[PDB]
């Protein structure tokens, strides 16, 4: 079971918190553009996810023209980013 | 619905282990005709209700193949079978040395036949059994569509609107 | 009414190009007047002297409305013919739907004053 | 039938959660993420049960366009916090 | 099921004994000596730090915002230990349908651990300082996703068990030669102190040191392996422990030798220097199994 | 469609179409009836000629008719509690 | 114990109860961690490991992470306790009574609803599939493909070009 | 802005092409959201507090519109399971389809955003991109003309002309009058859809051209009735004659070609034994005319807006379709009454 | 040369990582079309049967035989 | 079913010619431990 593996890790992690607490007795809009670029690149990576997974069966002449095309526009987006990006 | 009877399933089945059958793909070469008859029955008629007598021949021929291995060369076959289960999920790697011990024993018999290419869609011309067109699912022919208007259109009224 | 045995891409069907096109029609002349009218008020919005006597880019304004209007009328002559053709073919095929009544001298009430 | 009685109910609950307000404009965009999340599960169950194989790519595309709105609308929220002090529904000028 | 308990308690000991090796290797790199007064060779200090920090050392609350401050260690320690599950140590604990997808996701979910701790303090100077540290972790996970997707594109599916079979005679260091340099820098993402630095203090870095071992073993599978040998699991494990710890010394090497990059210039390392290089390699790794037949 | 796609292919929309490798649809056989029934405009505006083939196709995706049937068996199985009940397996 | 999907579906709605209620964007942010992570398990139970882990990589590994930034940019520092807030607890208590009261009627299998569809057993017909396929099957063994759907790759690329350019022009 | 403004503008043009040339349900879903990402930068433009408020009010209404539309797409998998845009096959999904498209258009219940969005638009170039945007939800409605219930379309069309006819009476803002004529005309759009789907496409042709002629003549900067007042004497007097041809045409007047929709919408409806609805259409249309009645007095009269400052230099705007389109907008009722066949 | 010799050595001096971004990605596009080796990869990709084989009923047909080893069908033997 | 109205014949489908998987959703209602093990390809995975 996967749930048996997960819960045992989390319950012992919370158990250490019980030991940690009970046992002792006595602004800037420029950083937002980073999060914007990250989220927009994630989806291009998400579209480029099935590369070592779909190439096994599908035609190569049809895929290669489209597979590189996603990485091209992933670099073209960065080419627009180069012209005045920021001081950070 | 009307299913098959209680005494329709063939006796003596699934005696071999899951990987014991996977150990020998010589079953694809010898005893292949009854397997192909059941295969051709399924693509023609999708229901399991009609193609079960062909499957009885499959189960009968399968036992005939394995009993030959039970009689002759039982020692190198079981050694290859203990090798195939000892490995994780590779199923063919780290067992090629004991694969050399196999086939060599079988070469004395006529049972030894290994393809180094595959199947690549084999045709069964000898098959008759039942005719293919017999309406597999269709009940109604579907009502005839709107008749196609043949002939060139001519202007008669020239606009049926309020004016001109 | 709606489209049945007709497809898009290239506005006239070309397969049903049998009917004769509009040649020197009064409908073409009125759009030609509108092409001239569009070449009159362009000198009114953009300040140019005399709508009748000004710059001669009006020849483009006359030709464009005639060119587009000709194919638009060609679409009109096509679609009205097809709508009529499908109407006539529906009566010829079914026959039972369209009923004919002939010869009647029925009595009707007469109004006074 | 069984599962669809909960995930459709979760969609209608989030539909109320969008249009109901307590002055916070951040919570509405957070519920737009939940709306796409509820649409993701409802689409997943329809495609995975009835083995489509081809339609499995469609919620992945839906996931991309989920994040397209929930970033470009989120960027406009920052512009409200640039012009005004703190983001509020009550703080408006349009008539 | 005793195996899960055999992958928490001896794993936490490896995190505990890391503090000695971090003090001893860096020590000998600085001509000073490691711990010696504590035990025979200072081996009794990891347990001594555990008694000191947990039992008598209290917590003076800055604000204690009800749900948070106690929730952030659960996202720290819990998610760091779940990463150990799908690891292809001879026969893994419940082998995943897709290995690396679980590896990349739980590492990207580990970003919350530093996020919720930023919310834990009321002071504005803490959270602005926290978001700056999130910005480093958020950016290098793009490169972490790209390099992984180009390594797997050479050979194997998402399963971690197939990554052993491809390295039967040849390591993946040599075909992915610029990526071997690239992945080593991108692993320094989860506040590794070598590129840049920002409940109680004790258990918070117990998860952070665990992630360092996690990336050290992850490098030792994706780039190392030598063989598998299903007959003897012992010969693989002895060889793996040497390969993994040699990379563990290298993380104690970069931290010892090299200063901070300046936060801005660390963000200039990505997008301007790293991302044009990795995407060009990603373009190159698409063409390779098509140019020459090799799509497993 | 408001504007048709002539001399170009961008469909792959309907179920039981061209498979990714050879993988079948769960309701492949039922649409082999449905598409063949309603390929003309006869049962498109009226939708009465293909009512028999639509009810079985609606049964394939929802399985509501089997759901009511299996519930009736399960309720009668619960009715056999402290009565004449027998379990073969 | 016997149910797998139905127990997780209740926790899924329970997360959305905190969205109908407005317990400040920080506690509402915790909803996407709870309902999102459980939302993976609902997808994972029917099959398709790839599609279930997509929420882990994007919603739980990007979307709410970026939403964590904007909570610090606007309406920050302290979240107000939902117990002290008026009508917020009222929306929470009415939200749970639309779900928990319904579950009692789902007991004994069949239940009456606003829609025509009934609840059913949801134990034997919970999977709704027999054997189907064999190798590289389960519908999502070959899930996403660049082949056949070549048009959809271009248009997704267009919108992701728009996103980078447009947000730069806004800020 | 250089090429990037044209590229963004071209993706709205491309976005509606995906909506027009389509067969898949998720394909049109993309087409709507391709516009959502692309209208917002033109909504902003001049870095305004009004532009930020309008775009946020525009997004939060139209993002919820798309997600309501996606629900109708998913119910189309719950029942039938066919992903071809032809019918909804549901009495439930048809409700969540029409109401979601009503949100994107200016239909009755979801109209509140329309006047306040139009006010926040910086320039006349951005004002076109709402009247042209309404082509996208109308194109889908033409595809799914059957299986959609009369009780929740015709009620939304009747109420929209009622609220549109009373929604511009207490308004003086030139943008606000155009925003409520939008709500008024959308009632005339969806009323045809059951009684033959044809003429709805022609109603677009008349509307889109007639609205584009307004804002291209509003290139001489005017936001209120009092700002468009100082135009008769201080500015050119021939410009007031050509706007008069567009003001009166928007209302139901037979010498002008803005009566050409009101020609066929009543005609097609009266064919199908309905007389009580077209009576209610034409009477409420006079309230739509009444806005332009008081707006014609800004151009026909003196009204005393002299202003001491006088312009000597001649005005040079864009005026791209400001000459070709008003000639067709003024007179086409005598030119092409047979154009019903040519368009649809 | 006006820019071939001029605007190449300047790129090596000023940010030489940008040289790698265009050259390696450039070779990723041009080389797949030039090389006469891509034909072999397509052959085995179609030859690998993921789905079960189907038998066709033959009535006077050529290039088809029994499942046993015989000179019939495709059966790729490209470099063993 | 002996006292009710159901005949347990003809099946739910009105076609009665195609006959699909049928016992994919059924697979016998009796003995829940066998039913849980049968539908556990994704869960546990052993």
Short mmCIF file of N, CA and C in Angstrom, two decimals, chain A residues 35 38-53, chain D residues 33 37 40 60 63-64 66-67, chain E residues 79 83 96 98-112 137-138 141-146 148-149 152 158 183 218, chain G residues 32-33 36-41 43-44 48-66:
data_model
loop_
_atom_site.label_atom_id
_atom_site.label_comp_id
_atom_site.label_asym_id
_atom_site.label_seq_id
_atom_site.Cartn_x
_atom_site.Cartn_y
_atom_site.Cartn_z
N UNK A 35 7.96 34.79 -10.43
CA UNK A 35 6.85 33.84 -10.27
C UNK A 35 6.00 33.69 -11.53
N UNK A 38 8.18 31.61 -14.08
CA UNK A 38 8.21 30.23 -13.58
C UNK A 38 6.97 29.43 -13.97
N UNK A 39 5.79 29.96 -13.65
CA UNK A 39 4.50 29.31 -13.91
C UNK A 39 4.23 29.12 -15.41
N UNK A 40 4.63 30.10 -16.22
CA UNK A 40 4.48 30.04 -17.67
C UNK A 40 5.42 29.03 -18.33
N UNK A 41 6.59 28.82 -17.72
CA UNK A 41 7.55 27.82 -18.21
C UNK A 41 7.20 26.40 -17.79
N UNK A 42 6.54 26.25 -16.64
CA UNK A 42 6.08 24.95 -16.12
C UNK A 42 5.18 24.21 -17.10
N UNK A 43 4.27 24.95 -17.73
CA UNK A 43 3.28 24.40 -18.67
C UNK A 43 3.92 23.95 -19.98
N UNK A 44 4.96 24.66 -20.40
CA UNK A 44 5.77 24.27 -21.56
C UNK A 44 6.60 23.02 -21.27
N UNK A 45 7.08 22.89 -20.03
CA UNK A 45 7.72 21.66 -19.54
C UNK A 45 6.70 20.52 -19.41
N UNK A 46 5.48 20.87 -18.98
CA UNK A 46 4.35 19.92 -18.89
C UNK A 46 3.91 19.38 -20.25
N UNK A 47 4.00 20.23 -21.28
CA UNK A 47 3.76 19.82 -22.67
C UNK A 47 4.94 19.05 -23.25
N UNK A 48 6.14 19.31 -22.73
CA UNK A 48 7.35 18.58 -23.12
C UNK A 48 7.65 17.36 -22.23
N UNK A 49 6.73 17.06 -21.30
CA UNK A 49 6.83 15.88 -20.44
C UNK A 49 6.79 14.51 -21.17
N UNK A 50 5.83 14.29 -22.11
CA UNK A 50 5.74 12.94 -22.70
C UNK A 50 6.81 12.57 -23.75
N UNK A 51 7.91 13.33 -23.80
CA UNK A 51 9.00 13.09 -24.76
C UNK A 51 9.68 11.70 -24.68
N UNK A 52 10.10 11.24 -23.47
CA UNK A 52 10.61 9.87 -23.41
C UNK A 52 9.52 8.85 -23.03
N UNK A 53 8.37 8.96 -23.69
CA UNK A 53 7.15 8.25 -23.30
C UNK A 53 6.19 8.04 -24.48
N UNK D 33 -8.96 28.77 -9.10
CA UNK D 33 -8.06 27.62 -9.11
C UNK D 33 -8.80 26.33 -8.73
N UNK D 37 -9.74 22.99 -10.80
CA UNK D 37 -9.38 21.73 -10.14
C UNK D 37 -10.57 20.76 -10.12
N UNK D 40 -11.08 19.60 -13.60
CA UNK D 40 -10.01 18.65 -13.92
C UNK D 40 -10.38 17.22 -13.51
N UNK D 60 -4.86 17.71 -19.83
CA UNK D 60 -3.49 18.23 -19.76
C UNK D 60 -3.42 19.62 -20.43
N UNK D 63 -5.33 21.94 -18.20
CA UNK D 63 -4.44 22.31 -17.09
C UNK D 63 -3.53 23.50 -17.44
N UNK D 64 -3.10 23.56 -18.70
CA UNK D 64 -2.28 24.67 -19.22
C UNK D 64 -3.09 25.97 -19.24
N UNK D 66 -5.81 26.52 -17.57
CA UNK D 66 -6.19 26.79 -16.18
C UNK D 66 -5.23 27.80 -15.57
N UNK D 67 -3.94 27.59 -15.82
CA UNK D 67 -2.86 28.43 -15.30
C UNK D 67 -2.66 29.71 -16.11
N UNK E 79 7.76 15.52 4.01
CA UNK E 79 7.99 15.45 2.56
C UNK E 79 9.41 15.02 2.18
N UNK E 83 10.33 11.06 0.01
CA UNK E 83 11.23 11.01 -1.15
C UNK E 83 12.08 9.73 -1.21
N UNK E 96 6.97 2.56 -7.96
CA UNK E 96 6.00 3.45 -8.62
C UNK E 96 5.81 3.12 -10.10
N UNK E 98 5.39 5.53 -12.32
CA UNK E 98 6.38 6.48 -12.83
C UNK E 98 7.22 6.98 -11.65
N UNK E 99 8.52 6.74 -11.73
CA UNK E 99 9.45 7.03 -10.63
C UNK E 99 9.78 8.49 -10.44
N UNK E 100 10.38 9.09 -11.48
CA UNK E 100 10.90 10.47 -11.43
C UNK E 100 9.83 11.57 -11.32
N UNK E 101 8.61 11.26 -11.76
CA UNK E 101 7.46 12.17 -11.60
C UNK E 101 7.09 12.37 -10.13
N UNK E 102 7.21 11.31 -9.34
CA UNK E 102 7.04 11.37 -7.89
C UNK E 102 8.23 12.07 -7.22
N UNK E 103 9.41 11.94 -7.84
CA UNK E 103 10.65 12.56 -7.34
C UNK E 103 10.67 14.07 -7.54
N UNK E 104 10.23 14.52 -8.71
CA UNK E 104 10.21 15.94 -9.07
C UNK E 104 9.08 16.71 -8.38
N UNK E 105 7.95 16.04 -8.16
CA UNK E 105 6.75 16.65 -7.56
C UNK E 105 6.89 16.94 -6.07
N UNK E 106 7.41 15.96 -5.32
CA UNK E 106 7.56 16.08 -3.86
C UNK E 106 8.72 17.01 -3.47
N UNK E 107 9.66 17.21 -4.39
CA UNK E 107 10.73 18.20 -4.25
C UNK E 107 10.21 19.62 -4.52
N UNK E 108 9.28 19.74 -5.46
CA UNK E 108 8.61 21.01 -5.78
C UNK E 108 7.52 21.37 -4.76
N UNK E 109 7.02 20.35 -4.05
CA UNK E 109 6.09 20.53 -2.94
C UNK E 109 6.83 20.90 -1.65
N UNK E 110 8.13 20.62 -1.61
CA UNK E 110 9.01 20.97 -0.48
C UNK E 110 9.33 22.47 -0.39
N UNK E 111 8.89 23.23 -1.39
CA UNK E 111 9.05 24.70 -1.43
C UNK E 111 8.19 25.38 -0.35
N UNK E 112 7.05 24.76 -0.02
CA UNK E 112 6.13 25.25 1.02
C UNK E 112 6.74 25.32 2.42
N UNK E 137 14.81 28.79 -4.80
CA UNK E 137 14.28 27.42 -4.86
C UNK E 137 13.30 27.25 -6.03
N UNK E 138 12.54 28.31 -6.32
CA UNK E 138 11.52 28.29 -7.37
C UNK E 138 12.11 28.28 -8.79
N UNK E 141 14.24 24.84 -10.08
CA UNK E 141 13.37 23.69 -10.34
C UNK E 141 12.90 23.61 -11.80
N UNK E 142 13.06 24.71 -12.53
CA UNK E 142 12.82 24.75 -13.98
C UNK E 142 13.94 23.98 -14.69
N UNK E 143 15.19 24.27 -14.30
CA UNK E 143 16.38 23.57 -14.81
C UNK E 143 16.40 22.10 -14.36
N UNK E 144 15.93 21.85 -13.14
CA UNK E 144 15.80 20.50 -12.58
C UNK E 144 14.82 19.63 -13.39
N UNK E 145 13.77 20.27 -13.92
CA UNK E 145 12.79 19.61 -14.78
C UNK E 145 13.31 19.37 -16.20
N UNK E 146 14.08 20.32 -16.72
CA UNK E 146 14.63 20.26 -18.09
C UNK E 146 15.73 19.19 -18.22
N UNK E 148 16.41 16.61 -16.26
CA UNK E 148 15.76 15.30 -16.10
C UNK E 148 15.09 14.80 -17.38
N UNK E 149 14.34 15.69 -18.04
CA UNK E 149 13.62 15.35 -19.28
C UNK E 149 14.52 15.12 -20.50
N UNK E 152 16.43 11.32 -19.47
CA UNK E 152 15.48 10.23 -19.73
C UNK E 152 15.20 10.02 -21.22
N UNK E 158 10.05 6.83 -17.38
CA UNK E 158 10.03 7.53 -16.09
C UNK E 158 10.34 6.64 -14.88
N UNK E 183 23.56 19.60 -13.94
CA UNK E 183 22.73 18.99 -12.89
C UNK E 183 23.34 19.16 -11.50
N UNK E 218 20.30 10.51 -5.79
CA UNK E 218 19.66 10.77 -7.08
C UNK E 218 20.66 11.00 -8.22
N UNK G 32 -6.29 24.29 -1.00
CA UNK G 32 -5.71 23.76 -2.25
C UNK G 32 -4.62 22.70 -2.03
N UNK G 33 -4.03 22.68 -0.84
CA UNK G 33 -3.08 21.64 -0.44
C UNK G 33 -3.83 20.36 -0.04
N UNK G 36 -6.43 19.45 -3.15
CA UNK G 36 -5.59 19.18 -4.31
C UNK G 36 -4.87 17.85 -4.23
N UNK G 37 -4.22 17.60 -3.09
CA UNK G 37 -3.49 16.36 -2.81
C UNK G 37 -4.37 15.12 -2.77
N UNK G 38 -5.57 15.27 -2.19
CA UNK G 38 -6.60 14.23 -2.18
C UNK G 38 -7.20 14.08 -3.59
N UNK G 39 -7.31 15.21 -4.30
CA UNK G 39 -7.76 15.25 -5.70
C UNK G 39 -6.92 14.44 -6.67
N UNK G 40 -5.64 14.24 -6.33
CA UNK G 40 -4.74 13.35 -7.06
C UNK G 40 -5.15 11.89 -6.88
N UNK G 41 -5.46 11.52 -5.63
CA UNK G 41 -5.85 10.16 -5.25
C UNK G 41 -7.13 9.66 -5.90
N UNK G 43 -8.13 10.64 -8.94
CA UNK G 43 -7.69 10.37 -10.31
C UNK G 43 -6.87 9.07 -10.37
N UNK G 44 -5.97 8.89 -9.40
CA UNK G 44 -5.06 7.74 -9.32
C UNK G 44 -5.74 6.37 -9.14
N UNK G 48 -4.20 5.64 -14.58
CA UNK G 48 -3.48 6.81 -15.11
C UNK G 48 -2.64 7.58 -14.11
N UNK G 49 -1.44 7.06 -13.83
CA UNK G 49 -0.51 7.65 -12.85
C UNK G 49 0.03 9.01 -13.28
N UNK G 50 0.21 9.19 -14.59
CA UNK G 50 0.72 10.43 -15.18
C UNK G 50 -0.20 11.62 -14.93
N UNK G 51 -1.49 11.43 -15.21
CA UNK G 51 -2.51 12.47 -15.09
C UNK G 51 -2.82 12.85 -13.64
N UNK G 52 -2.67 11.88 -12.73
CA UNK G 52 -2.83 12.09 -11.30
C UNK G 52 -1.69 12.90 -10.68
N UNK G 53 -0.49 12.73 -11.23
CA UNK G 53 0.71 13.44 -10.77
C UNK G 53 0.89 14.82 -11.42
N UNK G 54 0.01 15.16 -12.37
CA UNK G 54 0.00 16.47 -13.02
C UNK G 54 -0.43 17.59 -12.08
N UNK G 55 -1.34 17.26 -11.15
CA UNK G 55 -1.80 18.16 -10.09
C UNK G 55 -0.67 18.41 -9.08
N UNK G 56 0.10 17.36 -8.79
CA UNK G 56 1.30 17.44 -7.94
C UNK G 56 2.39 18.35 -8.50
N UNK G 57 2.54 18.34 -9.83
CA UNK G 57 3.60 19.09 -10.52
C UNK G 57 3.24 20.54 -10.86
N UNK G 58 1.96 20.80 -11.11
CA UNK G 58 1.50 22.12 -11.57
C UNK G 58 0.67 22.88 -10.52
N UNK G 59 -0.39 22.26 -10.02
CA UNK G 59 -1.24 22.87 -8.98
C UNK G 59 -0.55 22.94 -7.62
N UNK G 60 0.15 21.87 -7.27
CA UNK G 60 0.87 21.76 -6.00
C UNK G 60 2.36 22.07 -6.13
N UNK G 61 2.83 22.19 -7.37
CA UNK G 61 4.23 22.52 -7.66
C UNK G 61 4.40 23.72 -8.57
N UNK G 62 3.51 24.71 -8.42
CA UNK G 62 3.57 25.93 -9.21
C UNK G 62 2.45 26.92 -8.93
N UNK G 63 1.21 26.49 -9.18
CA UNK G 63 0.01 27.33 -9.12
C UNK G 63 -0.22 28.01 -7.77
N UNK G 64 -0.33 27.21 -6.71
CA UNK G 64 -0.52 27.72 -5.35
C UNK G 64 0.78 28.32 -4.77
N UNK G 65 1.92 27.89 -5.31
CA UNK G 65 3.24 28.45 -4.94
C UNK G 65 3.35 29.91 -5.39
N UNK G 66 2.87 30.20 -6.60
CA UNK G 66 2.80 31.57 -7.14
C UNK G 66 1.69 32.37 -6.43
#
